[PDB]
Design a binder for this molecule. Sequence first.
Ligand SMILES: CC(=O)N[C@@H]1[C@@H](O[C@@H]2O[C@H](CO)[C@H](O)[C@H](O)[C@H]2O)[C@@H](O)[C@@H](CO)O[C@@H]1O
Ligand SMILES: CC(=O)N[C@@H]1[C@@H](O[C@@H]2O[C@H](CO)[C@H](O)[C@H](O)[C@H]2O)[C@@H](O)[C@@H](CO)O[C@@H]1O
Ligand SMILES: CC(=O)N[C@@H]1[C@@H](O[C@@H]2O[C@H](CO)[C@H](O)[C@H](O)[C@H]2O)[C@@H](O)[C@@H](CO)O[C@@H]1O
Ligand SMILES: CC(=O)N[C@@H]1[C@@H](O[C@@H]2O[C@H](CO)[C@H](O)[C@H](O)[C@H]2O)[C@@H](O)[C@@H](CO)O[C@@H]1O
Lengths: 146, 146
Amino acid sequence: VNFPNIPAEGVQFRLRARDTGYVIYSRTENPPLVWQYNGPPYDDQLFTLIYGTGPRKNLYAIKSVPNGRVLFSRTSASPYVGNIAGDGTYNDNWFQFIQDDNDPNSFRIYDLASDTVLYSRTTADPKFGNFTGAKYDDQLWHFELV
Amino acid sequence: VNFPNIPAEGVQFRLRARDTGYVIYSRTENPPLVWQYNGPPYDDQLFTLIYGTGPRKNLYAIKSVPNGRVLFSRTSASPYVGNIAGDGTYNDNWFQFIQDDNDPNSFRIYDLASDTVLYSRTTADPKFGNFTGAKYDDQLWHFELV
Ligand SMILES: CC(=O)N[C@@H]1[C@@H](O[C@@H]2O[C@H](CO)[C@H](O)[C@H](O)[C@H]2O)[C@@H](O)[C@@H](CO)O[C@@H]1O
Ligand SMILES: CC(=O)N[C@@H]1[C@@H](O[C@@H]2O[C@H](CO)[C@H](O)[C@H](O)[C@H]2O)[C@@H](O)[C@@H](CO)O[C@@H]1O
Ligand SMILES: CC(=O)N[C@@H]1[C@@H](O[C@@H]2O[C@H](CO)[C@H](O)[C@H](O)[C@H]2O)[C@@H](O)[C@@H](CO)O[C@@H]1O
Ligand SMILES: CC(=O)N[C@@H]1[C@@H](O[C@@H]2O[C@H](CO)[C@H](O)[C@H](O)[C@H]2O)[C@@H](O)[C@@H](CO)O[C@@H]1O
C-alpha cells in the first residue's frame, strides 16, 4: 500500500529514519554525497518531491533543496545511492513510498528500477545504503515537515 | 523483492492461485471477461508476458494467447479487473510480480497504476478481483508453465 500521507508536491521536508533517528542528506561535494546524518539541521537535508505522471504515477523524484539534484538508488554501480542533475531523467530516479505493514506512520523508500529500499542502521558498514531482500525495521522512514 | 522465476518473454503459462487452485481466464465476451475458474485446462487461461522497459522496467503486460488482449487492474471504473487490446497501451496494463515475504515460491500480481493486487478466494463475493490493503494468502499466485 502506498503511504497515504505523502507531502504535497513542492513542499519541503527531511527524511528521518524511524529507528536510528538519522536523516538523509544530499550534497555536491565531499563523499559520501548522499548518506545518513546524526547532527544539527542543515539545508542539504531538505528535499521536495516531483510527482510522477503517466507511467510514473505513484512514483516520485526526490529533489535536494539547496542543489536541485535528484536522488538515485541503483545496484549497477557505486555509489549505489547518490544524486544527479535534472528532474528525474533516469528510471532509477523514481521512488515509491510503501507504507509499512505494521506501522501505518512509516514507509519504505522503494526504487522500482533497482528493486531496492533505503536503510539506516548503526551496526555494520555501510550504515546507510540500499537493499534488495527481507523487510527489516531499519528500512522505515518518516516525512518530517519543515 | 521481485519474484525470481518470472517466465521468459513469450513463454506460455497459466496463472494459478496458490490456495484456491483456481486459474485466471480472459475471454472476449460474457461478463466477467476476466475471472477465476475451477476446471479443465482451456486456451483462454493461457498467457504470455510482455517485458516492460525504461519506465516499465520490472513491470509486465499479461497477454492472452488466444485473443491477444492484455489484463488491466484499476479502481476508477467497473470492471476493476478486465482486458483490453494492444500490448500494454495503458498504464494500468502493467504489473509487478512481488515475491511473498514468507513463501518464496509464490507472488502477488501487483499493479503500480492502481496500487492493487489480484486475489482468488472461495469466501465472500466478489470471489475474484483486485485489492488495496494488507497481505493475505488469497493474493498469492504461481506461474504454471505449459
Ligand atoms: C563534521 C563532519 O565531518 N561530519 C561528517 C558529515 O559531514 C557533515 O554532513 C552534514 C550533513 O547535513 C553537512 O553536509 C556538513 O556540512 C558536513 O560537515 C558526514 O560526512 C558524515 C558521513 O557519515 O560523517 C560525519 O558525520
Ligand atoms: C552515461 C554515464 O556514464 N553517466 C554517469 C552516470 O551514470 C548514470 O547515473 C544515473 C543516476 O540516475 C543512472 O544510474 C544511469 O543508469 C547511469 O548511466 C552517473 O554514474 C555519474 C555519477 O554518478 O557519472 C556519469 O555521469
Ligand atoms: C547479508 C548482508 O550482509 N547483506 C548486505 C546488506 O545487509 C542487510 O541490510 C539490511 C538493510 O535493511 C539489514 O540491515 C540486514 O539485517 C542486513 O543483513 C546491506 O549492507 C547491503 C548494502 O549494499 O549489502 C549486503 O546486501
Ligand atoms: C473481511 C474480508 O472479507 N476480508 C477479505 C480478506 O480476507 C482475509 O483472507 C485471508 C486469507 O486470504 C484470511 O483468511 C483473513 O482472516 C481474512 O480476513 C481477503 O480476502 C482480502 C483480499 O485479499 O480482502 C477481503 O476484504
